[PDB]
Amino acid sequence: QVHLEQSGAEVKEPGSSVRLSCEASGYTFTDYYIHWVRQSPRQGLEWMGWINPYYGNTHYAEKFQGRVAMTRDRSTTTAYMDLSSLTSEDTAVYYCARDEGGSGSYSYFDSWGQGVLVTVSS
Amino acid sequence: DIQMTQSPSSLSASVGDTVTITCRASQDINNHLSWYQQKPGRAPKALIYSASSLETGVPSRFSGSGSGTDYTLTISSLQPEDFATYYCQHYSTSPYTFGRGTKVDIK
Amino acid sequence: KEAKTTLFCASDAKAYEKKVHNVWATHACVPTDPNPQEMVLKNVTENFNMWKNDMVDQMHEDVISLWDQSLKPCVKLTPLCVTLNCTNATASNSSIIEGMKNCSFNITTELRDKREKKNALFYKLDIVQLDGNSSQYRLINCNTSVITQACPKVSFDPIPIHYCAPAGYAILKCNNKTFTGTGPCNNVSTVQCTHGIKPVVSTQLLLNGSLAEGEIIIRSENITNNVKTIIVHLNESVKIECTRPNNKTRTSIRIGPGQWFYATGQVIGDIREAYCNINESKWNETLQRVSKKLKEYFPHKNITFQPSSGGDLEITTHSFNCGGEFFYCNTSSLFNRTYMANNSTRTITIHCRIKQIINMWQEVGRAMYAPPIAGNITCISNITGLLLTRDGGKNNTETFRPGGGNMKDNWRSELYKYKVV
Ligand SMILES: *[C@@H]1O[C@H](CO)[C@@H](O)[C@H](O)[C@H]1NC(C)=O
């Protein structure tokens, strides 16, 4: 009965940032991790990073280091993602992910959200 | 970094028969592997994980096998809502990397 | 046969002579039942799973609920979250000019004067610059959750709490000490109530814990999976001393009807931050033994230790409490060692910043103010366990860093033995 919900998005300008928010329900939010993945044509499913919702510690990707920022909010049980300094190849759909094996051995993530398009144009 | 290759993107198939799909890795990924079933317009769902153990609600049509640097999935007597794309993901270590995906289509 | 149920709490024959009913509740009506008997049983083997057990959530929920319900009859601090005009014109020390001394506010006090100029001393991390000039400041916690002063009656020590199962239920702690808590154990010592677990909160370290059997051990999920949170227990206890050297002035500003709020006056004595000492030889031998036993878990490549990454104050610091004050120690230089693959001298010291207002827990809920205390404070304890966390790179060095990222990892180091049947 676990559910991930994220809303829509609109067009942004290059050189700017974009705000993405996801919320979780059903299971207790502080006991697994939240992952971010990206789908686009002509590319694969490139890994973005993962966030601990209880603490502030995160882990990033070496391709995307410095251009992304992460934020947990345990009051509203939300995960916030900030891609910054957009480039024309980043027009893509974005997905959240609930991981399993919380504080143990994280192996495979199962519960995914709806996924939202983001498109950059000047 | 860890790079995978798969079968070619098109596999011929017929309703109610067997389908063998496979993907190869480049380094030691032990059994830290999982698969996903991508349907267009819908976020995909894991169906097999760790090459042996299935997830609840997913039937016994998807049998995973293999070890080392190549892994296989056999589909026995398939129904029409397995005509979608399949991705294989390693979770050995490091930033992750996904496969390119092969579709299942009717000739 | 295992099942899901709710246990209760018990205590020893020690009772509050100060009669602090609020914290006395920890043992107010909980039966002492101080008759711990042991039994031995044979022909039992079963896959124990400490990660997926049942009573750790029970422990976490009752600890957090006790911490919340210990503050309901106390005073509400809410009419203090106002504008803070803090000037810092003078400087007894150079590190005081950033929002600490004579931080004044216009307060309507007990004597019905609307705009009294009353000042206080505050800590620079505990205060935030409001979006404008630097002449005004704001409390970092009342933006998020409602702040509540702690009463003098809720002064806390770790009581060695005891869990007892009800009628029709039993608990089993496997005798095998080497048991990693994930797999088939052996001949079972059976009790009705476990040994005492003290509800101490800590990050990256275990203090006032329980010792090992004679050598150190490494426990976690089956190595078949990619283990991340590793709890390491040690056989050699290492003493740690943490101290603050400054006497403090305690002043009273009446903000509630008929009750008191306590604030910080002036600092008495030569001023320094908190500081902690670790014996170098025991620490070096401890990390040497931890590396040389952690090698056989991963017998292929090098292992190394790294300080924790950022994100908030708790993961970046060793966070604990002593004397009713919360301490955040750096601890970055304690985990910079790197090893190779294929008895007290020259003591090491670490800085440690102190805190007053903590966000505490239950962000759907309240938050804590800690009143100050006077006199130089020394706090001595023993460290027993580590909460390191594993990451792997593309190179041949497996990195570890202090962490765990849950309070449930603190309880799970001593509650791994028990399940309910
Ligand atoms: C600990 O001290 C080192 C010394 O430079 C510093 O780099 C690090 O940021 C400090 N960490 C904290 C949490 O104060």
Please spell the DSSP secondary structure of C336-396, one letter per residue: --B-------S-EEEEEEEESEE--S-SSSEEEE-----S-EEEEEEEEEE-EEEEE-SSS
User: How many angstroms separate the CA of residue C242 from the nearest CA in chain A?
Assistant: 25
Reading the block at residue A86, the tokens are 């957009």
Sign of the C-alpha dihedral computed for residues C239, C245, C249 and C254 taken in this order: negative
Query: Locate tokens 């202090």: which residue?
Result: C402
Domain of B80: which CATH number? 2.60.40.10
- The Cβ of residue C119 has, within 10 Å, a number of other Cβ atoms equal to 19
Torsion angle, alpha carbons of A38, A39, A41, A44, to 10: 80
DSSP secondary structure code for residue C116 in this structure:
E
CA distance, residue B79 to nearest chain A CA (Å): 22
Spatial CA neighbour of C195 closest among C180, C211, C176: C211
Residues from chain A that touch B95, judged by Cβ atoms under 8 A, are 47, 61-63
Give CA separation, C21 vs C196, C289, C324, in Å. Answer: 22, 46, 18
Residues 6+ apart with CB under 8 A from C226: A105, A106, A107, B32, B91, B92, B93
Contacts of B73-80 with C-beta under 8 Å, sequence gap 24+, read B73/B20, B73/B21, B73/B22, B73/B35, B73/B48, B74/B18, B74/B19, B74/B20, B75/B18, B75/B19, B75/B20, B75/B21, B76/B18, B77/B16, B77/B17, B77/B18, B78/B13, B78/B15, B78/B16, B78/B17, B78/B19, B79/B15, B79/B16, B80/B15
Token pair listed for C383: 């460290």
Closest to C28 in 3D by CA, of C40, C36, C20 = C20
Place of tokens 């010792």: C211
Nearest-angstrom CA–CA distance, C223 and C230: 11
The residues facing C232 across adjacent strands are: C218, C386
Consecutive H or E run containing C287: helix C280-294
Whether the Cβ atoms of residue A21 and residue A82 lie closer than 8 Å to each other: no
In chain C the domains, ranked by start, together with CATH numbers, are 21-72+156-245+271-411 (2.170.40.20)
**Ligand 1 atom showing the smallest separation from residue C332 Cα:** 1
- The resolution, in Å, is 4.2
3-state secondary structure B8-25: CCEEEECCCCEEEEEEEC
- Name the CA dihedral angle for C108, C109, C111, C114, rounded to a multiple of 10 degrees: -10
Contacts of C46 (CB under 8 A, 6+ apart): C184, C185
- The values of phi and psi at residue A93, to 5°, are -100, 140
Provide φ and ψ at C58, rounded to 5°: -60, -45
If we measure between CA atoms, which residue out of B98, B107, B102 comes closest to residue B1?
B98
Q: Whose CA is nearest to atom 7 of ligand 1?
A: C332
Q: What kind and span of H or E run contains B87?
A: strand B85-90
A62 chain-B contacts, CB cut-off 8 A:
95
Ligand 1 proximity of C316 Cβ (cutoff 6 Å):
yes
Say if strands B45-49 and B33-38 run parallel, antiparallel, or are unpaired: antiparallel
Q: Which residue of A has its CA nearest to C388?
A: A103
Residues in chain B, total: 107
Bin C360: left if φ > 0, else alpha if -120 < ψ < 50, else beta: left
In angstroms, the CA A69 to CA A66 distance is 7
Neighbouring C-alpha atoms within 13 Å toward the C-beta of A121: 4
Q: Is A15 exposed, middle or buried (0-12, 13-18, 19+ CB in 10 A)?
A: exposed
Does the beta-carbon distance from B93 to C224 stay under 8 Å? no
* CB atoms inside a 10 Å sphere around CB C374: 12
Domain of residue B66, residue span: 5-106
DSSP letter at C67 equals H
Which of C329, C332, C350 is the best mutation target for the ligand 1 pocket, counting ligand atoms within 8 Å of the beta carbon and taking the most? Answer: C332
User: CA–CA separation, C28 vs C21, rounded Å?
Assistant: 7
**What backbone phi and psi angles, to 5 degrees, belong to A5?**
-130, 125
Q: Is C72 helix (H, G, I), strand (E, B) or coil?
A: coil
Contact C393, C400 (CB under 8 A): no
Residue type, A82: D
User: Nearest 10 degrees: CA dihedral of C309, C313, C316, C318?
Assistant: -160
Strand partners, A79: A22, A72
Q: How far is B105 from chain C (nearest CA, A)?
A: 35
Residue A31 has φ and ψ, to the nearest 5°, of -115, -5
- Asked if C229's CB is within 8 angstroms of A55's CB, the reply is no
Distance from CA of A10 to the nearest CA of C (A): 29
Distance CA B4, CA B24 (A): 6
Count CB-CB contacts under 10 A for residue C225: 19
**Distance, C-alpha C32 to centroid of its chain:** 26
Domain count, chain B: 1
Instruction: List CB contacts (< 8 A) between B91 and chain A.
Output: 106-108
Query: By the CB < 8 Å criterion, does A106 face chain C?
Result: yes
The CA distance from C255 to C258, in Å, is 9
Report how far residue C303's alpha carbon sits from residue C232's, in angstroms, rounded to the nearest whole number: 15
What is the Cα gyration radius of chain A?
14
CA distance C394 to B90: 14
Which of C145, C225, C388 has the highest number of chain A CBs within 10 A, making it the mutation to test binding with A?
Answer: C225
E strands, chain A, where?
3-6, 17-25, 34-39, 47-51, 58-59, 68-73, 78-84, 92-98, 111-112, 116-118
Residues pairing with C248 in the sheet: C267
Give the closest residue (by CA) to ligand 1 atom 14: C330
> Chains near C, with 3+ CB pairs < 8 A?
A, B
> Judged by CB atoms within 8 Å, which residues 382-421 of C form the interface with A?
391, 403-406, 408-409
Q: What is d(CA C268, CA C261) in angstroms, rounded to the nearest whole number?
A: 21
The alpha carbon of residue C380 and the mean position of all alpha carbons in its chain are separated, in whole angstroms, by 15
C30 close to C16: Cβ distance less than 8 angstroms: no
Question: Which domains, from first to last, does chain A contain?
Answer: 3-101 (2.60.40.10)
